[PDB]
Design a protein around this ligand. Structure first.
Ligand SMILES: O=C(O)C(=O)C[C@@H](O)C(=O)O
Ligand SMILES: O=C(O)C(=O)C[C@@H](O)C(=O)O
Ligand SMILES: [Mn+2]
Ligand SMILES: [Mn+2]
Lengths: 303, 300
């Protein structure tokens, strides 16, 4: 499984590959030591633009790193020592978000007639983006209706416009997790969702970006969200109203999708707003979103 | 102080308009005057440097008036240069205000007490004189919207109304070209607002020091010569300072962020028979003293 990450260790930010879910390889330093080359770019978004050849190079480096050698510790780090950022800490454009792409989410937010015949697409500013283990601001002076949304995110590899459904997966690099944290009152107040979706720190992403070659069946992916331990959301990607291929086809009809664009494909039912008494987030709340085999994205709402 | 992104000999460069006929290549001017190289290669990077950059640009322009042998190595006639959008590649989506003029809101079917805010993808951004794709296989309801755009010069969150202009770098023009059917179809405006090439911007970015009175600015839009729109920035429902205060309440505005402040009445959708854009149509948007932003709708 090819799982890429942006890590930080002793104030160096680096593009990393997860090895056996316990170690992470610093790909640039590994390339230098094992291949005596320096070609790997310093950000994952630049690596994504290189496509399959970067991924095959990374796979080769991981294979070589298993051969006996005496300087493993210069480039192979235990995950416990490494802070994971969002795989793409600074997207080049807003995160593209789909609204109401699971039937029961649409229903819990209103009724059956709120189910779209066409995708509802909005965005989150890049200033939302944060990583596994980061504190999300509670934004208490702005809203008392912060809510969680666990989602599967797709990262585009090959750039393209007018992409057909049939070719869509050819333009996909990989998959990560997003928490599309939303201020529900701000959504209603401003009508368009941008402001209520774009508060600082409200898009945890990660913990890793799994290359599509490790996930040939994305329709079988499952999203689970727990809030303070309690199961809130449990969706299957196959229940999406619009599939990933349809979303890519729609989005690209008149617009170029570019390497490293991130599409959040919508949350299942189970959001805070959906309960009678609504259950909004508060300081100290812990949110864990699991999609195997991406792993678990965990954040706490700040004090 | 009118800044631009020009292109000459296949190189894009940050420029300063001199006497509305010439453009100074700031990096090459600095090198020739000071034999130093500190000016960054994009306008957004220059904006992030703050007041330092503007004072340096002022100094270079003053020096460039002195006789000097090789003026032509850094001072070009505007007619020889292609102008891009001042910020050809924003670092995030353009922030757009909907319904910020009374009569625009009315002509579209009816006034907000809170701003309606959406975005345009960076892939929309294009420059003065560039062709806007007609997108005929996607929509037959392309429409025009002349607007004043504000560029943030200094990053901030929880910016007060009173301090708002302190976070402003300058002003440019945008054409917020919109597919009206796609707006209705997808409900949120993003898709209808984010077709490739549908955000002409420019032709220049005027530093705020040349416009201390933005409420007196006027937008005029002509389509094939004909006056369609005519707004005054003073009729905006929410002012520039209020928009900055609202936007930044829970969100960091960063150096180089662009806010399109809304279009007056006169849009194609506002006429009975609606007047949508077609291949060959020419749109000219004028805001003095920024100048005129001109684009043509492309071939099918
Ligand atoms: O469905 C999602 O994942 C959304 O972001 C939309 C949600 O905010 C809503 O209004 O129901
Ligand atoms: O007022 C503007 O500038 C807008 O972009 C909004 C407009 O597209 C609308 O349908 O309300
Ligand atoms: Mn969502
Ligand atoms: Mn507009």
């Amino acid at each position: 499984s090819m799982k890429f990450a942006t890590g930080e260790l002793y104030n160096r930010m680096f593009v990393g590959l997860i090895i056996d879910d316990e170690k992470i390889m610093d790909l640039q330093k590994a390339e230098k030591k094992l291949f005596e080359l320096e070609t790997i770019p310093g950000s994952l978004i630049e690596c994504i633009a290189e496509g399959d050849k970067f991924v095959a190079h990374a796979r080769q480096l991981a294979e070589w790193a298993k051969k006996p050698n005496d300087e493993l510790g210069s480039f192979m780090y235990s995950l416990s020592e490494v802070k994971l950022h969002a795989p793409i800490p600074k997207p080049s454009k807003n995160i593209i978000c789909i609204g109401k792409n699971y039937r029961d989410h649409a229903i819990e937010m209103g009724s059956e007639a709120d189910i779209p015949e066409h995708p509802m697409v909005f965005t989150k500013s890049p200033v939302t983006v944060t990583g596994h283990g980061d504190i999300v601001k509670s934004h208490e002076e702005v809203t008392s209706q912060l809510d969680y949304e666990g989602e599967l995110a797709v990262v585009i590899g090959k750039s393209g416009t007018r992409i057909s459904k049939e070719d869509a997966y050819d333009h996909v690099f990989g998959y990560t997790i997003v928490n599309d944290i939303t201020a529900r009152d701000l959504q209603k107040r401003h009508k368009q969702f941008f402001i209520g979706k774009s508060l600082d720190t409200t898009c945890p992403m990660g913990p890793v970006l799994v290359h599509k070659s490790s996930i040939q069946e994305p329709e079988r992916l499952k999203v689970e969200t727990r809030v303070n331990g309690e199961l809130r959301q449990s969706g299957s990607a196959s229940d999406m109203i619009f599939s990933i291929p349809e979303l890519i086809e729609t989005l690209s009809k008149g617009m170029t999708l570019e390497a490293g664009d991130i599409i959040a494909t919508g949350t299942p039912s189970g959001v805070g707003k959906g309960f009678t008494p609504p259950k909004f987030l508060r300081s100290g709340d812990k949110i864990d979103i699991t999609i195997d085999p991406i792993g678990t994205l965990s954040n706490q709402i700040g004090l």
